Paper text:
Considering their programmability and biocompatibility, encapsulin is a promising platform for the delivery of proteins or small ligands and nanoreactors.
Using single-particle cryo-EM, we determined the structure of T. maritima encapsulin packaged with a heterologous IDM complex. To encapsulate the IDM complex in vivo, six subunits of IDM and encapsulin from T. maritima were constructed into individual operons and coexpressed in the insect cells. The 30 amino acid cargo-loading peptide was fused at the C-terminal of the IDM1 protein. The overall resolution of the encapsulin icosahedral shell was solved at 2.87 Å based on the gold standard Fourier Shell Correlation (FSC) 0.143 threshold. In our IDM-loaded encapsulin structure, we have found extra density at the fivefold pore in both icosahedral shells. To test if the extra densities were an image-processing artifact of icosahedral reconstruction along the symmetric axes, we then performed de novo C1 reconstruction and found extra densities at all 12 fivefold pores in the C1 reconstruction. The extra density should thus be authentic structural features of the IDM-loaded encapsulin that might be caused by substrate binding or cell factors copurified from the insect cell.
Residue numbers in the entry:
A (entry chain A), B (entry chain A), C (entry chain A): 4 to 267
The structure:
Amino acid sequence: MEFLKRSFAPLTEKQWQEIDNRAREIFKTQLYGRKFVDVEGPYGWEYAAHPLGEVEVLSDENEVVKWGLRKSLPLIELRATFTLDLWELDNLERGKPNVDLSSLEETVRKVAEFEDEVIFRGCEKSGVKGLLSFEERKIECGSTPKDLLEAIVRALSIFSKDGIEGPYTLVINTDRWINFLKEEAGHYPLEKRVEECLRGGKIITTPRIEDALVVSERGGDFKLILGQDLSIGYEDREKDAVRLFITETFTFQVVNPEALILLK
Amino acid sequence: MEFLKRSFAPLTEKQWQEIDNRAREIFKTQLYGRKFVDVEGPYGWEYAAHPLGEVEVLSDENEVVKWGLRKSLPLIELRATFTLDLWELDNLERGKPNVDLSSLEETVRKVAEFEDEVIFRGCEKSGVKGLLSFEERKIECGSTPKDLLEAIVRALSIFSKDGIEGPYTLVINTDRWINFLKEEAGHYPLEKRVEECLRGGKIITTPRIEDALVVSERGGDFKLILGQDLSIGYEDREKDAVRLFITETFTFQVVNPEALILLK
Amino acid sequence: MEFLKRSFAPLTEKQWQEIDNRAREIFKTQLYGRKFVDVEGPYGWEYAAHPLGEVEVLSDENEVVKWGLRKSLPLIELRATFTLDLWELDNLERGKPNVDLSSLEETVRKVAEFEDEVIFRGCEKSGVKGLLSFEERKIECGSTPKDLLEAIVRALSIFSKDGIEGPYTLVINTDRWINFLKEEAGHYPLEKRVEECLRGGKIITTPRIEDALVVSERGGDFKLILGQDLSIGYEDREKDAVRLFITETFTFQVVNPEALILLK
């Protein structure tokens, strides 16, 4: 929006469109948490904190009037900057079909990594606890495909006792998935054995996790709080090059850890 | 069209039709690039160059008035000739069901090879760079079916980081495909393992490539510029035999090499 | 248009208008070729090459499939820059009737010279051959007004044998015209003798030619290919002064040299 100062950038709508398109593509392919966790919002651009629903009592014990502070999560405000040559975007309206947008891509990837780190590991400063921080819900299993299938069945039994329902999905490191696919036959695809044991579920290979998670997708158990979603705006000129920025505001909340299981 | 001088050939519409039909069949089965790359046009018959969208500056540095030349790709104009006996096409209207059209077939195959060479290797004279010239995007993999599947998964991970989406297709040499199918079981078809790892994609066996390519089919990344598409016209008489020709005008452009991956 | 970034210049419409007006005036008075040669287009801003209608065959002699490259003329892209003080354009809306626009005028004159040089001499780099390069069509004549009239009659006889019709015009260096007017009487204006021998034609005094040309104006024999016509846009700030630029894209083609005659 208006705080992005896009109107003041020496660019045509065509160039803005190309930039936005490439950003969207990289993001859709590089944002992995967005695949498992719900999204609420956007609340922005002014939204500053998400309530937790508790009071920390600061009053002493023998005070007549008891009082405390109501708790919330501060939204994380993200800024990153790109620099694009001008002589090279105007070749777009000169008829060039492929305009170099490399710095955009690099920095987009970096911010995607940032958000995925928050979701998966969290942030102490912000008070966010990541999915991989709920060590209290973890299975110890082997390292073969068969061990993996047994572990998945165990996980679904756990979900059963805890009342957790819904489609299930398995988030794996890419390398471990590849090695599971390589380690044993072959006489029936492993992905099918899995999608069967993972009863109507899916597999999602994610390089930002090392081992694996099993999560239910019924809804409402992991949620990303959105103020200002990812947006690109303008800062200044270089002057032969334009400096833009990408920004966001967000927090993350694990609501029901019972819908989460870690695997070794 | 009119530049083809078909009206001046001592032939009936029946004979023209037979000729055109056989040409179309051979072409549909022998034109392999047409299976992966988009086609724009036809622009012909006068279209002479396709713009690139850049200026090469020829002005010196200290000139007051700066100037350069706007760049483009010249269209390649293709001619080949056939000779057909007359006594042998008139047997068509005499009731013969199978008329010999061998020279047509041979020369059609040759021109198909020509276009496929341009697409795959390119042309220095014309300034076309072929698919197999983007060595900067190449994977080193093994030689077994399992190695192949691992390589395909690696390729799709690459497409993932580069923001490349869409159906995927695997262009292979026929011999290597056959040997992959022969080398190991058997207890589950390899083509299915592939179409699965090649997630909803295809395999296309192409004798004009030696090893393999993986390419996305989302659209707009490889494109063939068409002026005058493949057409047959008339030159002269022999006189007992008619001399015809086949012609085309075309260039080729790889727009987004990120949608391209070479395999060993 | 939009590639000119006029909207991003810290200027009001009044100032843009003054600038454009002065540019147009200087151009109309300083563009001499525009007086004789036809103009086609504008094709821009993406137009990159104008077809010539020929194929250069690169195929060897004994190749089965013959091929070549279709030929064209690259458009020349022209850039020049002006710098205008700000404190001095805002006095326009302060009520000043005469705003200093000298750098504009100088640079406009320079680019006009550039285009006239291309038309008259041509450009080797671009492959343009100028009017004064067709030495094969040249008359040797005297240096007196009477010699000039005889030469004009000879030229029209030539046009006669070559089938060239239409109004005729005589492009002369200014100095030679003046000296012809001074050299002999006087008892009947020379311009009238000329316009008579130059049967219903004209005289156009042009400082970018040294001796003279006679050309027919029937149409279609000399033509200027226009992509982006002359236009002014914005580059940056200085910051107390605004930097603008003037740009064009064009080529030139002599189609029928029979409509052209050079005089000594």
